[PDB]
Amino acid sequence: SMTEYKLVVVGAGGVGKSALTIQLIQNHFVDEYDPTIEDSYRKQVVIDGETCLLDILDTAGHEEYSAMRDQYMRTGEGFLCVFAINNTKSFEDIHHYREQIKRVKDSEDVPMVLVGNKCDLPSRTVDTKQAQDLARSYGIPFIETSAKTRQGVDDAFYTLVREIRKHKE
Amino acid sequence: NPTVFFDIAVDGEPLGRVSFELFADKVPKTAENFRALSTGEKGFGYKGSCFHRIIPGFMCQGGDFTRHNGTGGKSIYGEKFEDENFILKHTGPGILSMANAGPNTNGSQFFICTAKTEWLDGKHVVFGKVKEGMNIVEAMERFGSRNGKTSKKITIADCGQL
Numbered sequence: 001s002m003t004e005y006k007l008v009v010v011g012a013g014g015v016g017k018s019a020l021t022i023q024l025i026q027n028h029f030v031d032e033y034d035p036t037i038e039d040s041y042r043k044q045v046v047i048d049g050e051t052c053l054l055d056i057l058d059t060a061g062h063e064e065y066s067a068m069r070d071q072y073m074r075t076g077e078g079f080l081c082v083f084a085i086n087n088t089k090s091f092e093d094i095h096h097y098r099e100q101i102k103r104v105k106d107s108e109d110v111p112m113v114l115v116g117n118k119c120d121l122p123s124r125t126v127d128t129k130q131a132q133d134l135a136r137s138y139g140i141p142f143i144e145t146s147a148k149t150r151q152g153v154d155d156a157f158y159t160l161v162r163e164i165r166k167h168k169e
Numbered sequence: 170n171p172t173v174f175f176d177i178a179v180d181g182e183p184l185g186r187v188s189f190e191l192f193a194d195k196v197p198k199t200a201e202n203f204r205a206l207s208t209g210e211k212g213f214g215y216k217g218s219c220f221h222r223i224i225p226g227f228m229c230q231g232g233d234f235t236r237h238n239g240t241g242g243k244s245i246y247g248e249k250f251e252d253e254n255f256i257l258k259h260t261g262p263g264i265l266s267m268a269n270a271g272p273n274t275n276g277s278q279f280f281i282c283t284a285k286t287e288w289l290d291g292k293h294v295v296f297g298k299v300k301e302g303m304n305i306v307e308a309m310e311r312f313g314s315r316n317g318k319t320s321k322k323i324t325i326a327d328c329g330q331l
């Protein structure tokens with residue numbers, strides 16, 4: 001049977017979590033602001049020559065509900081931690097999302113990928129080397145993405161599947 | 170304080186009429202926006218639009234008449250207008266309050282509470298309350314879900330001022 005992988009997308013409001021997810025699932029780019037409550041998606045993909053099923057939870061970045069993340073952090077197998085490269089605050093929120101995931105999972109070793117989104121925009125405020133250094137100190141991969149141009153979208157989700165797979169085995 | 174009405178339909182079948190008092194004494198600008206959008210007198214408004222987000226236990230949200238997907242809407246003052254005041258609180262079922270995308274982003278989207286939602290106080294402008302037909306709003310919860318997606322099309326078939 002096909003292996004199912006439970007992925008969760010987290011990050012501050014407006015960084016592009018849903019835009020990335022809808023690019024992966026539906027291959028189109030949502031220009032509009034549609035803040036998420038909670039959404040779930042399914043997609044089968046071929047990764048390293050094997051078909052697998054991605055179950056993707058798109059979560060709310062709305063800062064008011066930070067105390068209600070525990071249930072989905074318990075069930076998720078791997079985490080896409082998204083910031084936007086033109087929003088320094090979203091980059092600083094990353095540390096807090098990661099710690100929260102570690103606290104709920106009670107584990108310092110959780111499949112994760114750091115994602116710097118909106119790399120199509122010129123107004124960059126977070127330096128690539130700064131995110132590379134941060135990811136290196138976490139021991140996790142780092143990928144720059146654009147949900148607008150699709151740059152890195154497949155690679156980010158596929159890399160997280162590879163991380164989860166290494167953790168299961 | 171003016172009174173407006175919505176005639177609600179479920180997949181085109183009548184469900185009944187909900188009426189609202191609009192608190193023009195406390196939030197005159199916000200009340201006038203909703204009143205004018207209910208009559209359609211500016212050439213656009215709520216008639217024909219849907220309730221796109223219904224979460225049982227919390228609220229029914231609608232008013233996106235420009236995009237019909239939860240991302241649109243506009244006020245009679247422009248696409249957005251400022252938070253008028255937060256004098257009134259989300260005290261219980263029937264409160265009518267503005268949806269928004271953060272500070273000073275009111276448009277046309279609104280929500281009707283079906284419970285007390287105290288943590289929204291100071292963040293959403295309360296401007297009205299259900300006068301008659303609260304059980305119709307309760308009945309709209311039958312078509313909602315945990316993330317708000319509706320199982321039938323809940324529309325404002327007609328609306329106006331009483």
Ligand SMILES: CCn1c(-c2cc(N3CCN(C)CC3)cnc2[C@H](C)OC)c2c3cc(ccc31)-c1csc(n1)C[C@H](NC(=O)[C@H]1C[C@@H]1C)C(=O)N1CCC[C@H](N1)C(=O)OCC(C)(C)C2
Pocket residue numbers: 033034035036037038060062065068222224227228230239240267268269270278279280288289293315316317
């Ligand atoms: C943690 C999960 N969650 C939850 C939540 C919260 C609880 N609590 C239990 C304990 N009590 C004490 C505290 C709360 C329980 N269960 C859930 C849900 C059912 O678990 C899935 C909410 C929520 C809201 C947003 C994101 C995630 C969210 C959000 C995301 S954008 C937003 N809010 C504000 C929203 N802007 C818009 O639409 C903009 C586009 C237009 C212009 C908006 O103006 N309005 C009007 C007011 C209501 C709000 N929509 C809305 O829909 O609130 C849903 C509600 C369920 C009331 C709160």
Ligand SMILES: Nc1nc2c(ncn2[C@@H]2O[C@H](COP(=O)(O)OP(=O)(O)NP(=O)(O)O)[C@@H](O)[C@H]2O)c(=O)[nH]1
Pocket residue numbers: 011012013014015016017018019020030031032033034035036037059060061062117118119120121145146147148149
């Ligand atoms: N230029 C550009 N804009 C993007 C990109 N990703 C998302 N956006 C835009 O940024 C805004 C927010 O996108 P969205 O995916 O809704 O963000 P979110 O993280 O899901 N927000 P929430 O946590 O409220 O659900 C939208 O206007 C969207 O079109 C990107 O890669 N490039």
Ligand SMILES: [Mg+2]
Pocket residue numbers: 017018019034035036058059060061
């Ligand atoms: Mg989202």
